[PDB]
Amino acid sequence: AIIKEFMRFKVHMEGSVNGHEFEIEGEGEGRPYEGTQTAKLKVTKGGPLPFAWDILSPQFSKAYVKHPADIPDYLKLSFPEGFKWERVMNFEDGGVVTVTQDSSLQDGEFIYKVKLRGTNFPSDGPVMQKKTMGWVASSERMYPEDGALKGESKQRLKLKDGGHYDAEFWTTYKAKKPVQLPGAYNVNIKLDITSHNEDYTIVEQYERAEGRHS
Numbered sequence: 621a622i623i624k625e626f627m628r629f630k631v632h633m634e635g636s637v638n639g640h641e642f643e644i645e646g647e648g649e650g651r652p653y654e655g656t657q658t659a660k661l662k663v664t665k666g667g668p669l670p671f672a673w674d675i676l677s678p679q680f681s682k683a684y685v686k687h688p689a690d691i692p693d694y695l696k697l698s699f700p701e702g703f704k705w706e707r708v709m710n711f712e713d714g715g716v717v718t719v720t721q722d723s724s725l726q727d728g729e730f731i732y733k734v735k736l737r738g739t740n741f742p743s744d745g746p747v748m749q750k751k752t753m754g755w756v757a758s759s760e761r762m763y764p765e766d767g768a769l770k771g772e773s774k775q776r777l778k779l780k781d782g783g784h785y786d787a788e789f790w791t792t793y794k795a796k797k798p799v800q801l802p803g804a805y806n807v808n809i810k811l812d813i814t815s816h817n818e819d820y821t822i823v824e825q826y827e828r829a830e831g832r833h834s
Contacts, residue, residue, distance in 0.1 A: 623652050623683065623696050628729045631659065631680050635736030637717075638748060642666025646680060652696065655686030655830045658814070661823045668819035671741070672752040674777055675709070677811060677825055679719050679734050682793065685807055686830040692802040694769050698795035700725040707791040709775075715741035746777070746785050753778040757810045760789070761834075764801040769793040771807070806832050 626649065633644040643665035650657025659680050663669060682705070687693040695703055702724040709717040717738040724731045741747045760773040770792050777785040809829045816823045 622699050622725070624728075625651060625653055627652050627683070629659075629681065629732055630729060631661075631732035631734065633676070633679065633734035633736060635676075635734070635738070637669075637671045637675070637736075637738030638741050638743075640666060640670055642669055644676070648681065650681075650684045652684045653686060655684060656828050657681060657684040657826070659825045661825070663821040667821045669821075670748065670750075671738070672747045672750050672777075673813070673816070673820045673823055674752040674754060675715075675717055675738060675747055676736070677813065677823075678709075678755070678775075678789075679707070679721065679736060680825060681723075681730070681732065681827070682829070683723065683730060684827070684829065688831065688833075691805050691831050691833075692800045694795060694799060694801055695723075695793060697799035698723075698797065701796040702730075703793055703795045705791055705793045707789065709787050709789055711741070711747070711787045712785065713742055713745045715739075715745065715747055746779055751780045752785060753780055754813055755811050756784075757808070760791075760807040760809060761804070762802065762807060762831075763804040767794070767798075767801075769795075769801060773809075804834055806834055808832060 628649045631646040646661035648659035707719040722733045756776045760771040775787045812826045
């Protein structure tokens, strides 16, 4: 009804990483009930970015998660009003990214507003040196708490030297109206950079996400 089988979205992000300010504008589309989506991002200020694109890619859409019938789809149920989320990403070398986001529905399209602050990344580290090569497939553990939906997950970036660069994600998702929260469950996530230009000022992403029982 409100969330149709094919849905587009528009996303604006403003942020700074190690003090470098930037903006990104993107448009996306996907199949909310099949858990698939793609997005085309364009850097509109601060380009080219002097840091790894990978730290931004997870911020560009949980209305597109395939849920079984016995797990309440809290975030789809939040619409048309929508929801907000806030995220902490702690990286193993001290790098930190904090994100806040608002999701609404306007004229049949999702509208995403993102604010992002990355700090304390070592100048020598893989993020500021652009040595990351995408996220390994991951699983986010979901659980209700204090009237919100929370998720935590261990994440891992592949590196150019064959190594890995690990992070811990904490996110809180809060609907703008009281709708039904699920029990605990797992969301399996595959996030891919499907194409990009040389300086990563134009990037395309694909994500598949599906809720499964713990």
